[PDB]
From a paper:
Kinesins are a superfamily of microtubule (MT)-based molecular motors that play important roles in cellular functions such as mitosis, cell motility, and intracellular transport. The kinesin motor domain is the MT-binding engine that drives these activities, converting the chemical energy of ATP binding and hydrolysis into mechanical force. Recently, it has been demonstrated that a subset of kinesin superfamily members, including kinesin-2s, −3 s, −8 s, and −12 s, are sequestered by kinesin-binding protein (KBP; KIF1BP; KIAA1279), which inhibits MT track attachment by their motor domains and, thus, blocks their MT-related functions. Here we present cryo-electron microscopy (cryo-EM) structures of KBP alone and of KBP bound to the motor domain of the human mitotic kinesin KIF15 (a 110 kDa complex).
To elucidate the mechanism of kinesin inhibition by KBP, we determined the structure of KBP in complex with the human KIF15 (kinesin-12) motor domain (KIF15_MD, 1–375). The overall resolution of this KBP–KIF15_MD6S complex was 6.9 Å, with KBP and KIF15_MD6S determined to similar local resolutions. We built a model of the complex via flexible fitting using our KBP model and the KIF15_MD crystal structure. The complex is arranged such that KIF15_MD6S sits in the concave face of the KBP α-solenoid, analogous to a baseball enclosed in a baseball glove. When the structure of KBP-alone is superimposed onto KBP in the KBP–KIF15_MD6S complex, it is clear that KBP undergoes a conformational change in the presence of its kinesin motor domain-binding partner, with the largest differences resulting from an unfurling motion of its N-terminal subdomain. The structure of the KBP–KIF15_MD6S complex revealed that KBP binds the kinesin motor domain via the tubulin-binding subdomain. While the P-loop and Switch 1/2 subdomains of the KIF15_MD crystal structure and associated Mg2+-ADP generally fitted well into density of the KBP–KIF15_MD6S complex, a large portion of the tubulin-binding subdomain did not. In particular, there is a striking lack of density in the expected position for helix α4. Instead, there was a strong density of length and width consistent with helix α4 displaced by ~15 Å into the concave face of KBP, which we modelled as such. This displacement of helix α4, which lies close to the TPR-repeat region of the N-terminal subdomain of KBP, is accompanied by additional rearrangements of the flanking L11 and L12 in KIF15_MD6S (labelled KL11 and KL12).
Author numbering:
A (entry chain B): 26 to 37, 48 to 125, 128 to 152, 158 to 250, 254 to 307, 310 to 362
B (entry chain A): 3 to 26, 33 to 53, 84 to 128, 134 to 176, 195 to 241, 248 to 286, 304 to 330, 392 to 527, ...
């Protein structure tokens, strides 16, 4: 079943009251409405508490070989960048993110588990203007996704690196995040616009053979802006004074979504982002969901749409 | 009041910045600031001059695009409904621009009842415009806003269910676009026709897509699009086989189309397109049961199809491959089922106990039970109704096909009996055919408890 684990960034007109960690009460303007979830993290919970309980439990269960689907996600100002990347590089334990904590915990599991062998696969990708970019090489740009016959879906142009320890992982992750700082100076104007995906895939040999795989995603999708995120039970309305060629292409593909029938073959020509995610949602693994969120005062209607998206994840 | 040169330079500055701020940290904030600076510049604080009326209409349109830049259209909604109220009090194009902004504002209201009511009044205004009371004789911009509000009424049609209405009107939009990348729109129209049962305008839009790709117009994603055109060609043939089952020239055009399909399929990769290949090839090689000898030839041909599928898909193996190959071995199991029926037919009508014949048919039988054992490994012995159909099929395979020494039949019927017991205490739900295998298991338990005590000694 789906285990929704959910982190809330401290908002400090929140209009939210929290009775327990499972359930939130959301006062709304027409009428207040209560929303229950499996696990909702609050202001008072720490980074280490979420890491320990949520991340340590799920990473342990991931070590068995199921791809528990850990991902950061959110709108603009969601709190993703502080908790995973950290605000700046200025070794500071609480200010550095949960990602090197996951590195040191995974390599602690690796060396205490280590009786080809346990193999690390890490990759950073960022998607701007529907184009794949790798931060390792500036030339690496517009590389194309392919799902291989390995069952390993990957970017054709990308080259992974093996990592022996969490310190080298911190060096590579700080180099990639420093390339994100340099990239913030570059054509990547906003983290809202890009789709930055850091994935960790961990391989294991049984004993020498059979391969066990876990996936740890750090996704930085569209933010709070209102142009994208292909399907919505709110605004399924493409809104724009543009050329009806392209508007009508999207109108065609949503008309194909009308032309399903009354056995959904999940769409792969929709977006490459959601294909690189369709390996996860509806994958054959445990449905463990670490998700970051943030409720927002300002876009209260769109954060109601995200809470309804959390119920859509629940169903 | 603002004179002509001043309102023209205000128009030029407003449209210039509002259309240069979209090509490409806070440029759109300053763009909104300069548009509200123009809103301060208008001075908000026949009969008279109607140029002031068309000016207030077009600057209320600019107020609407300012508010959709803010996405805080509420005061803009009130000012725009006041403007369209005073325009409804009174015409060539002010009504149609007010109708575009009216549909936009009630679309951004995001409530389906009032938006659909205002959009039916929009349809009233559209046919009142189409009663027939510059760029090219006051027709070109009218044509592009005709595309605009026709696509937005298609949007409000798909917001409701309205399948035939949105399909007919999207046909109208693509035909109005074809008055002066469209093969996928014809593909979705024909896909709607696949979801329906009429198939003449389906063929007409196949020919339309073919002639607009032959006349695309040139001073790409087309490979997968024409691949899906092959897919809907063989789906039209599948619908013909459906209406003929539940002539020769249809099979000939299907064979030519699937060969050209095969070519343009293996040209463009790929991963999932080969799943579509084995899907529609197994469909057209399964439903075309019309002869005897050529029936055996096309059975050997689809065995060749799965045989060229096999030896690189065994190396493939995702868990996704376990799912899709569970469906593929389900199809191959049905193929072995009616090939078992063909085997008992050719055993009735020809001398079966020749050595190579019985060797070949027990080879196919052991391959069928091997793939059934692979379906057993699909369940982790160390959504479920096809598994009940497969339980029926493995029970019939455990019952009938054994021509060896009669010692495995009793344990095979015992395994199917305990599987039937496992289903009737695991689901407590009605099957579709397993009452026949229930009484068949009763009679076979009786006869293999009786007869081997008389024939095995
Ligand atoms: N849990 C938290 N506690 C305190 N401040 C936070 C927390 N999460 C985020 N912030 C702050 O909020 C701001 C926006 O967070 P950020 O992670 O950049 O959101 P996003 O990644 O969605 O843009 C940052 O300045 C960050 O320091
Ligand atoms: Mg961020």
């Amino acid at each position: 079943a789906i285990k929704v684990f959910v982190r809330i960034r401290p908002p400090a007109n929140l209009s939210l009251s929290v009775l327990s960690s499972t359930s939130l009460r959301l006062h709304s303007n027409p009428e207040p409405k209560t929303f229950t979830f499996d696990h909702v993290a609050d202001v008072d919970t720490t980074q280490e508490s979420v890491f320990a309980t949520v991340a340590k439990s799920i990473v342990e269960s991931c070590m068995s070989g199921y791809n528990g689907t850990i991902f950061a996600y959110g709108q603009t100002g969601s709190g993703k960048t502080f908790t995973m990347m950290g605000p700046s590089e200025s070794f500071s334990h609480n200010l550095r993110g949960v990602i090197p904590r996951s590195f040191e915990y995974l390599f602690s599991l690796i060396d205490r588990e280590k009786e080809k062998s346990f193999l690390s696969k890490c990759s950073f990708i960022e998607i701007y203007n529907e184009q794949i970019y790798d931060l390792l090489d500036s030339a690496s740009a517009g590389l194309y996704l392919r799902e291989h016959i390995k069952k390993g879906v990957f970017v054709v142009g990308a080259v992974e690196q093996v990592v022996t320890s969490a310190a080298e992982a911190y060096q590579v992750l700080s180099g990639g995040w420093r390339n994100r700082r340099v990239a913030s100076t570059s054509m990547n104007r906003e983290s809202s616009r890009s789709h930055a995906v850091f994935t960790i895939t961990i391989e294991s040999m049984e004993k020498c053979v059979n391969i066990r795989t876990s996936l740890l995603n750090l996704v930085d999708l569209a933010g709070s802006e209102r142009q994208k995120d292909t399907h919505a039970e709110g605004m399924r309305l493409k809104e724009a004074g543009n050329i009806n060629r392209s508007l009508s292409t999207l109108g065609q593909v949503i008309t194909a979504l009308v032309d399903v029938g009354n056995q959904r073959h999940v769409s792969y020509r929709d977006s490459k982002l959601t294909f690189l995610l369709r390996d996860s949602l509806g994958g054959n693994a445990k449905t463990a969901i670490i998700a970051n969120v943030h409720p927002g005062s300002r876009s209260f209607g769109e954060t109601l749409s995200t809470l309804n998206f959390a119920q859509r994840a629940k169903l | 009041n603002v004179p002509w040169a001043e309102v023209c330079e205000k128009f030029q500055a407003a449209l210039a910045l509002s259309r240069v701020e979209l090509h490409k940290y806070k440029s759109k904030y300053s763009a909104r600031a300069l548009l509200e600076e123009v809103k301060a510049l208008l001075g908000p604080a026949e009969g008279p001059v109607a140029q002031r009326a068309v000016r207030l209409a077009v600057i209320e349109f600019h107020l609407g695009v300012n508010h959709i830049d803010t996405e805080e259209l509420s005061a803009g909604e009130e000012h725009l409904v006041k403007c369209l109220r005073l325009l409804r009090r009174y015409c060539i194009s002010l009504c149609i621009q007010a109708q575009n902004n009216l549909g936009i504002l009630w679309s951004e209201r995001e409530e389906i009842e009032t938006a659909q009511a205002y959009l039916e009044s929009s349809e009233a205004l559209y046919n009142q415009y189409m009663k027939e009371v510059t760029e090219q004789e006051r027709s070109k911009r009218f044509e592009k806003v005709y595309t605009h509000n026709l696509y937005y009424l298609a949007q409000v049609y798909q917001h409701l269910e309205m399948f035939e209405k949105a399909a007919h009107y999207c046909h109208s939009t693509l035909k109005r676009q074809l008055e002066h990348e469209w093969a996928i729109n014809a593909a979705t129209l024909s896909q709607f026709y696949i979801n329906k049962l009429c198939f003449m305008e389906a063929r007409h839009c196949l020919s339309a897509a073919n002639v607009i790709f032959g006349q695309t117009g040139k001073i790409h994603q087309r490979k997968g699009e024409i691949a899906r055109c092959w897919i809907k060609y063989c789906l039209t043939l599948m619908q013909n086989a459906q209406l003929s089952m539940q002539a020769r020239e249809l099979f000939l055009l299907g064979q030519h189309y699937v060969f050209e399909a095969k070519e343009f399929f293996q040209i463009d990769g790929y991963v999932t397109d080969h799943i579509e290949v084995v899907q529609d090839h197994s469909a057209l090689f399964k439903v075309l049961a019309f002869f005897e000898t050529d029936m055996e030839r096309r059975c050997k041909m689809h065995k060749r199809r799965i045989a060229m599928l096999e030896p690189l898909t065994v190396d493939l193996n995702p868990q996704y491959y376990l799912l899709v190959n569970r469906q593929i071995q389900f199809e191959i199991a049905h193929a072995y089922y009616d090939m078992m029926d063909l085997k008992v037919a050719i055993a009735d009508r020809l001398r079966d106990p020749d050595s190579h014949i019985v060797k070949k048919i027990n080879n196919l039988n052991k391959s069928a039970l091997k793939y059934y054992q692979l379906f057993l490994d699909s369940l982790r012995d160390p959504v479920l109704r096809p598994a009940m159909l497969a339980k029926f099929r493995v029970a019939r395979l455990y019952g009938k096909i054994i021509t060896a020494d009669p010692k495995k039949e009793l344990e095979n019927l015992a395994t199917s009996l305990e599987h039937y017991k496992f289903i009737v205490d695991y689901c407590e739900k009605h099957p579709e055919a397993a009452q026949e295998i229930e009484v068949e298991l009763e009679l076979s338990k009786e006869m293999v408890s009786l007869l081997p005590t008389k024939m095995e000694r």
